[PDB]
Structure formats: C-alpha cells, structure tokens
Amino acid sequence: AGKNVNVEFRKGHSSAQYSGEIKGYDYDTYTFYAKKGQKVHVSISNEGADTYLFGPGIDDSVDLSRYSPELDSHGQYSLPASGKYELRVLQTRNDARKNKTKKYNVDIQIK
Incomplete structure (x- = not known):
C-alpha cells in the first residue's frame, strides 16, 4: 500500500520535505512527535492529494x-x-x- 515515514528535521530547523506518489486507496503517513501548542503548517504541490492530521x-x-x-x-x-x-x-474516495494517482511534494513545518 502506501508508505509510513518518520518525520525528521535537520537539527535546529523546523521543516522537512518529502516526495511521494499515492495510487488508488493507498495513503502515505508522516509520523511525528510534538508538544501541545506547537504549530503545524503543511504545504503540498498537488492539491488533489488531501492532507489530514490525526493524533492526540x-x-x-x-x-x-x-x-x-x-x-x-x-x-x-x-x-x-x-x-x-x-x-x-490521501486521495478522495x-x-x-x-x-x-497523485504525485506530490509535501512540506511539513512544525514550530
């Protein structure tokens, strides 16, 4: 199916960039640990690829x-x-x- 990746930032920096491609029902998961009140900003090159956040x-x-x-x-x-x-x-149903298929570049920023 899709891939599951652990988000890692270069030390002292607050974003990482990933590339992928999802097909059919496949979805990619970017996993991260963060603190309450930290702010997330996600940009993606392909607006056909939805970007949803799950967590505590x-x-x-x-x-x-x-x-x-x-x-x-x-x-x-x-x-x-x-x-x-x-x-x-992920894609729409x-x-x-x-x-x-959705080819994409995603930027994940956490501050």
Missing part, C-alpha cells in the same frame, strides 16, 4: 490543506495535545475508486 486531542481528523477553516491566517494549526501525530496524504 483530535476527534477524527483535522484538514490541514490550504483552504481549510481549521487553519489560522498564517496557514497554521495549533496542536491540542502532546504526543504522536500522523499526517496522512472518488479518485481512489477510479484508480487515479
């Missing part, structure tokens, strides 16, 4: 994509709890069902 203090998931109402004016989301979070990159 989150009911279901939070839409982190650029037009999501969950973000502030800086495109950031404040983590509600400390612990292990998952950023999932429609595109999944139609066996489409």
Whole structure:
C-alpha cells in the first residue's frame, strides 16, 4: 500500500520535505512527535492529494490543506495535545475508486 515515514528535521530547523506518489486507496503517513501548542503548517504541490492530521486531542481528523477553516491566517494549526501525530496524504474516495494517482511534494513545518 502506501508508505509510513518518520518525520525528521535537520537539527535546529523546523521543516522537512518529502516526495511521494499515492495510487488508488493507498495513503502515505508522516509520523511525528510534538508538544501541545506547537504549530503545524503543511504545504503540498498537488492539491488533489488531501492532507489530514490525526493524533492526540483530535476527534477524527483535522484538514490541514490550504483552504481549510481549521487553519489560522498564517496557514497554521495549533496542536491540542502532546504526543504522536500522523499526517496522512490521501486521495478522495472518488479518485481512489477510479484508480487515479497523485504525485506530490509535501512540506511539513512544525514550530
């Protein structure tokens, strides 16, 4: 299926970049540990690839994509709890069902 990757930042830096490609129902998971109140910002090159956040203090998931109402004016989301979070990159059920593919570059920033 999709891949599961542990997010690692270069020491002293606050973002990492990854590339992937999801097909059909495959979704990629970028896992990270962070502290309550730290802010996450995710940008992705392909808007056909949804970007949802799962983790502690989150009911279901939070839409982190650029037009999501969950973000502030800086495109950031404040983590509600400390612990292990998952950023999932996936397609819509429609595109999944139609066996489409999404090639993407994702940037994950945590401050």
